[PDB]
Amino acid sequence: ALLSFERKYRVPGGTLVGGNLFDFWVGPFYVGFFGVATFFFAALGIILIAWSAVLQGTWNPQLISVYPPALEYGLGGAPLAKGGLWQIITICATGAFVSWALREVEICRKLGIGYHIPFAFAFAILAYLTLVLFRPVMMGAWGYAFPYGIWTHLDWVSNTGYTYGNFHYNPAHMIAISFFFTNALALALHGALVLSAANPEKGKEMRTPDHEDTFFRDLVGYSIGTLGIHRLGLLLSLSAVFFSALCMIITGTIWFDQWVDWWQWWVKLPWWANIPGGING
Amino acid sequence: QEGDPEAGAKAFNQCQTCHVIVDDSGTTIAGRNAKTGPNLYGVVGRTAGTQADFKGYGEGMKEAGAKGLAWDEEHFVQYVQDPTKFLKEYTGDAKAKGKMTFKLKKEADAHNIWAYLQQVAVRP
Amino acid sequence: GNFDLASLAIYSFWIFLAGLIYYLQTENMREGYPLENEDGTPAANQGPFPLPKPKTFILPHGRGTLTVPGPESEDRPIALARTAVSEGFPHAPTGDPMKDGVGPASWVARRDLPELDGHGHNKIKPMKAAAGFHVSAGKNPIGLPVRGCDLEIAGKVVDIWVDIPEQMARFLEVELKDGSTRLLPMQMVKVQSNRVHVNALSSDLFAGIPTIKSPTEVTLLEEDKICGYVAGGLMYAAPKRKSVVA
Amino acid sequence: FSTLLGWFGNAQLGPIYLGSLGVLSLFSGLMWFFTIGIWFWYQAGWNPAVFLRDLFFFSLEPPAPEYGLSFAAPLKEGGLWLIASFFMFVAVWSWWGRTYLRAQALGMGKHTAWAFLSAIWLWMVLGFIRPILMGSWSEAVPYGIFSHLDWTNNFSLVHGNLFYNPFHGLSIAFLYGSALLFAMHGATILAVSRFGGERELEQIADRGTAAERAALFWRWTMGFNATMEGIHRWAIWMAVLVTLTGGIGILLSGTVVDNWYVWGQNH
Ligand code: BCL
Ligand code: BCL
Ligand code: BCL
Ligand SMILES: CC[C@H]1c2cc3[nH]c4c(c3C)C(=O)[C@H](C(=O)OC)c4c3nc(cc4[nH]c(cc(n2)[C@@H]1C)c(C(C)=O)c4C)[C@@H](C)[C@@H]3CCC(=O)OC/C=C(\C)CCC[C@@H](C)CCC[C@@H](C)CCCC(C)C
Ligand code: HEM
Ligand SMILES: CCCCCCCCCCCC[N+](C)(C)[O-]
Ligand SMILES: CCCCCCCCCCCC[N+](C)(C)[O-]
Ligand SMILES: [Cl-]
Ligand SMILES: [Fe+2]
């Protein structure tokens, strides 16, 4: 159950806790102290969700929704059947995520590779925690987070959005999206370039990293190189998620009116706010 | 004629992403428990921006009702084609604002919905 | 009689996706498969996905071909022994892992030749042999000493190897105490205003570092030999790593 | 003759050849930019001050629904829109063609041409196919910063909350995936760059310790893994699948499905 070159790598060590105690594998997966942890949280949350499935009265994975503690509840607790569960689950989740990340750290150590991977992943977690912790905490209530339901979480987005008109107008929201689209483009382009250099016209030698840079340049006008393209994807992707957390952390905490009104500042500048004509005059 | 209700009903659907129709009993005549906008039950003949439950009326909507607006076919149709504009003209204020981020393009659609409104959302 | 176009489309699409998934996966089985046991013999339980049909890569510069998937190359004794008779357990080094090249200090039996750029010239050259490459990057590392995680010095920077194509420094030639010199992976050394810190290797393991036959060019095989050794130090040169690392 | 094509073929902007199409591309491009631009100024009242303050408010709207699909619409009410679009059309397709030929010229695979093709499918659907199938250019996207964002919102509301569109979701799934995947591959590569990993093509033809550690990192983390090559076969599909599925979903809107919420409750 190993790769024809996995061997020489499966040496002992690299852990962060427990030492050689949990330092082993279960088939393809590596366990480590945080492997059992991730499994713990994972399973606990899985259960609690199913419990909520029963309390709710259905096993259809398209109806099962775990709603948080009603607004009134504030930041205190709540009955298991009335938000309590959502809270604990949201605990197992945070945990399972942070575990899943630390487990990566042990694997990065054993292989003598970089730490960029979990480092990035952390961003997803901040983003998450932003929606289910920070934002609600700043706004003063758990009820402000989103439900854990396949479709019931989309409605949350819908509603939460129209709660401020056409969310589009959110400056931060604009940037993020911008990053999301560019990343997609960037990722597409990247793959395409390598595959096209590795799989050239029938009967030709693979292309050279130079044919690669001469092509990419003839599209953008600049040469960013290999180390550069990857450092840009990681950059583009992380940014998007970052400008997203920012995008929300301000919505309802410092901004309350419809995002479209925010742009008035630009229009209302003294030197032109009162000039007749145009659209806003 | 001049407003097919059964046609307006299908139309109103798209309104359901923000509106809902519920009588004073608490029963749904149309809607998905959407609260982004006000309950349209009784909108007919009602004064603009006076629905007791809705707490998100814009300044234009409130001020336009206080000036004497009570939704009748004529004005209703002008509203769903471009709220903000409508609210500006009728309000007389060039800096008025509407919160209904939606525009019903077909003028016919409006007349059909209004009919549906007359058939299902008129508080006796 | 008619059909719901949308739902037919959504349905079709899924059939498609699965197929793509299968395609992708199998395609990603040219390197590493078939799977062997901790023993060295086939696992027989390769999985649901089958190996793909062989394809041949015509390498440039006349380096030859490459047909994948194909016979497993890996030819070099693995200085590691089981730790238990139960599958799924580590394999501890018999001798010196850093030297025997295992775990975090492993290397691959890559072609024994230097990487060539688009024209056919080496990709990496010692700057003091480059075609007009100056040190405008900022701080000149040439000259300054080179110490290990033990804080003891082990030599000085003699020259910077540059990646002519991508135009970026990739190696640091540091002369040792016995006249000879060694190569260091830039990423594994921090350049300070007064010295070079190699938190990866100990001031004594600066010799174990593999050498490059040609004193003006390093072949791919040699890079794997080096880097792997250096990076592996992190894990194995920990007993001699002086705390308070920055 | 060929002499002229040979002249053009060498068009450049420094160390890069612009090719024949490349000229038609850029030229047609500026004409597009020029078309929208002129209009904006007309709407600004030729006053630079007003232009700069309402720059995101200007919108070159498409013809009215009454004008159907004819090009009879007067300039200040639909004409400029068509003209602009006409340029953006030639602009884009030229560029696609350039990307293709330039790959053939270097003797490479036509992947980039294909990838780009998926993005064009979405563009193509929004401003051309769907309007034609719907029967009018009024169903088209207007040129303007704020204006097209307004479009989008309305488009959704009109068709019963796109969220409930399977193809909208499928798409979004891939949009997120793309971030995720590139976020991974990017970090991963960097993580093994010390082993000269960024040099993927050479790792493709001559596996290095880098292409092993990576493959091993994930195999231990998630149970499976890619190959220095294949990962990119993921990267490409992962991305192209955004506009693809994407395109489809928009095309089905209005033409086949009226309200996605409802269509969702029945399925
Ligand atoms: C009508 C609705 C509004 C609107 C309302 C909102 C609201 C409300 C929000 C957004 C948010 C977002 N919007 Mg919006 N949005 C609108 C229209 C758009 C349009 C468009 C074409 O018009 C676009 C492109 C976007 C784009 C976006 C994204 C930039 C952003 C999502 C953050 C993210 O991806 O985190 C991705 C990553 C995470 C969320 C991390 C969590 C993942 C965890 C860490 C890992 C999961 C592990 C898992 C459980 C294990 C699985 C099981 C195993 C497989 C076995 N919106 C309209 C106008 N939008 C969100 C935002 O800003 O978020 C910060 C947000 O809250
Ligand atoms: C800020 C952005 C919003 C948001 C906005 C949207 C929108 C808009 C859409 C989704 C959609 C989806 N969302 Mg969401 N979503 C948010 C946060 C989450 C979180 C989380 C822990 O934070 C999770 C697990 C999900 C999960 C999902 C998937 C079920 C679905 C499509 C997969 C996808 O896009 O994968 C990207 C990642 C991958 C492809 C990698 C593999 C990940 C797998 C696919 C995730 C498994 C999720 C699983 C079913 C639930 C696990 C439960 C545990 C087993 C107990 N969302 C936040 C609140 N989400 C789409 C849908 O169809 O909704 C109905 C959709 O259109
Ligand atoms: C209220 C609004 C609705 C909504 C309505 C719509 C509509 C309507 C659409 C989407 C579409 C999309 N939505 Mg949505 N969407 C909503 C909420 C969301 C949320 C969220 C968390 O809330 C998310 C994550 C998304 C995500 C997405 C993306 C998956 C998808 C766009 C792909 C793309 O960017 O292609 C970007 C790439 C292109 C458009 C390619 C075309 C580019 C051409 C080829 C090149 C132009 C060159 C040019 C001339 C140069 C100009 C330079 C610029 C000026 C800078 N939506 C809400 C519920 N959404 C789109 C979709 O499904 O598309 C298929 C779509 O049509
Ligand atoms: C810059 C941020 C981007 C990013 C990066 C990223 N994601 C990552 C990584 C990185 C760098 C990993 O290394 C890690 C990975 O291993 O790759 C597959 C991962 C990963 N990203 C994942 C998902 C994911 N990433 C997403 C987004 C993003 N990831 C961003 C775009 C999304 C979204 C919202 O689009 C999703 C769904 C996982 C597949 C994987 C991490 C696996 C993991 O954490 O497992 C932990 C444990 C379980 C399997 C059990 C969870 C059970 C319960 C504890 C919780 C569930 C309840 C509730 C919280 C969810 C309910 C969902 C409802 C909303 C429907
Ligand atoms: C669907 C085509 C639709 C109709 C019809 C409609 C009507 C409508 C009326 C008559 C009012 C005024 C009510 C009163 O004075 O009591 C009104 C107000 C708001 N609407 Fe609406 N509306 C329709 C659709 C939508 C949609 C899709 C949304 C959300 C994007 C929406 C929102 C709102 C809001 C908000 C208001 C209050 C506005 C204010 O106070 O300025 N409507 N709508
Ligand atoms: C000088 C003004 C520049 C304005 C450029 C406006 C870009 C808005 C593009 C969105 C419209 C897209 N399209 C093709 C679908 O119509
Ligand atoms: C090529 C990468 C594989 C990506 C697999 C992603 C599956 C996500 C599916 C989301 C479910 C969407 N929906 C609405 C159609 O059910
Ligand atoms: Cl191919
Ligand atoms: Fe790559």
Q: Output the six-digit token pair for D204.
A: 């493709």
Q: Which residues in C lie closer than 8 A to residue A12 (C-beta atoms)?
A: 83, 90-92
| Residue from the list C24, C108, C223 with its beta carbon closest to the beta carbon of D230 | C24
- Solving technique: X-ray
Residue D241 near residue A187, CB atoms below 8 Å: no
Helix axes A209-220, D79-106, angle to 10 degrees: 170
Q: Output the six-digit token pair for C16.
A: 């498609």
Ligand 6 centre and the CA of B36: distance in Å?
30
- Count of residues making up chain B: 124
Taking the Cβ of residue C234 and every Cβ of chain A, the question of whether any pair is shorter than 8 Å is answered with yes
**Does residue A183 fall inside a structural domain?**
yes
Residues A158 and A178 in one domain: no
Q: Output the six-digit token pair for D221.
A: 């983390």
Binding residues of A for (7R,8Z)-bacteriochlorophyll b: 153, 173
Residues A27 and A145 in one domain: yes
B27-to-B24, B31, B33, B51, B71 alpha-carbon distances in Å: 8, 10, 11, 17, 23
Residues 6+ apart with CB under 8 A from A255: A164, A262
**Does residue A128 fall inside a structural domain?**
yes
Name the resolution in angstroms.
Answer: 3.2
CA dist A156 and A142 (Å) reads 13
Chains that touch A (3 or more CB pairs under 8 A): B, C, D
Ligand 2 centre and the CA of A124: distance in Å?
12
Phi, then psi, of A30 in degrees rounded to 5: -100, 145
Contact across the interface for A165 and B17, Cβ inside 8 Å? no
Domain D1-109 belongs to what topology? Photosynthetic Reaction Center, subunit M; domain 1 (1.20.85)
Residue ranges and CATH numbers for the domains of chain B are 1-124 (1.10.760.10)
Residue ranges and CATH numbers for the domains of chain C are 5-109 (4.10.540.10), 110-241 (3.90.50.10)
Reported as type and span, the H/E element at residue C154 is strand C153-163
Contact across the interface for A8 and C103, Cβ inside 8 Å? yes
Domain count within chain A = 2
Residues A148 and A174 in one domain: no
- Indicate which CATH number applies to the domain containing A131: 1.20.85.10
**Does residue A280 fall inside a structural domain?**
no
Residues 6+ apart with CB under 8 A from B99: A165, A258, B56, B57, B58, B61
**Domain boundary, last residue among A163, A198, A230:** A163
Q: Output the six-digit token pair for A140.
A: 């003063």
Query: Considering only CA atoms, which of A159, A155, A177 is closest in space to residue A168?
Result: A177
Closest ligand 4 atom number to CA of residue A49:
57
Does the domain at residues D110-267 carry the CATH identifier 3.40.50.10880?
A: no
Neighbours of C213 (CB within 10 A): 9
- Work out the burial of residue A226: count CB atoms within 10 Å of its CB; fewer than 13 is exposed, 13-18 middle, 19 or more buried: buried
Residues A152 and A216 in one domain: no
Q: Which residues in A lie closer than 8 A to residue B17 (C-beta atoms)?
A: 158, 162
**Domain boundary, last residue among A163, A183, A206:** A163
* Mutation target among C224, C229, C235 for the D interface, most CBs of D within 10 A: C224
Residue A38's Cβ-side half-sphere holds a number of Cα atoms within 13 Å equal to: 17
DSSP secondary structure of chain D: --HHHHHHTT-BSSSSB--HHHHHHHHHHHHHHHHHHHHHHHHHTT-HHHHHHSTTT--B----GGGTT-S-S-GGGTHHHHHHHHHHHHHHHHHHHHHHHHHHHHT--SHHHHHHHHHHHHHHIIIIIHHHHHT-GGGSPPBSHHHHHHHHHHHHHHTT-GGG-HHHHHHHHHHHHHHHHHHHHHHHHHHTGGGT-S-HHHHHHS--HHHHHHHHHHHHHHS----TTHHHHHHHHHHHHHHHHHHHHHHHHHHTBS-HHHHHHT-
Residues A193 and A103 in one domain: no
Residues A53 and A95 in one domain: yes
Taking the Cβ of residue D170 and every Cβ of chain C, the question of whether any pair is shorter than 8 Å is answered with yes
Q: Give the ranges where chain A is alpha helix by DSSP (H).
A: 32-56, 85-110, 116-129, 135-139, 152-162, 171-198, 209-220, 226-249, 259-262, 264-267, 270-273
DSSP secondary structure of D146-190: HHHHHHHHHHHHHTT-GGG-HHHHHHHHHHHHHHHHHHHHHHHHH
**Does residue A281 fall inside a structural domain?**
no
**Does residue A171 fall inside a structural domain?**
yes
Q: Among the bound ligands, name the one nearest to the CA of residue B57.
A: 5
**Does residue A70 fall inside a structural domain?**
yes
Taking the Cβ of residue C59 and every Cβ of chain A, the question of whether any pair is shorter than 8 Å is answered with yes
Q: Which residues in A lie closer than 8 A to residue C38 (C-beta atoms)?
A: 2, 7, 10
Ligand 9 centre and the CA of D187: distance in Å?
10
A51-to-A48, A87, A89, B19, C72 alpha-carbon distances in Å: 5, 14, 11, 33, 50
Determine whether the annotation assigns residue D159 to a binding site.
Answer: no
CA dist A34 and B51 (Å) reads 55
**Does residue A11 fall inside a structural domain?**
yes
Q: Which domain holds residue A93?
A: 1-163
Residue C163 near residue C127, CB atoms below 8 Å: no
**Domain boundary, last residue among A145, A163, A181:** A163
| Numbered ranges of CATH 1.20.85.10 in chain D | 1-109, 110-267
Residue B6 near residue B112, CB atoms below 8 Å: no
- Amino acid identity of D197? G
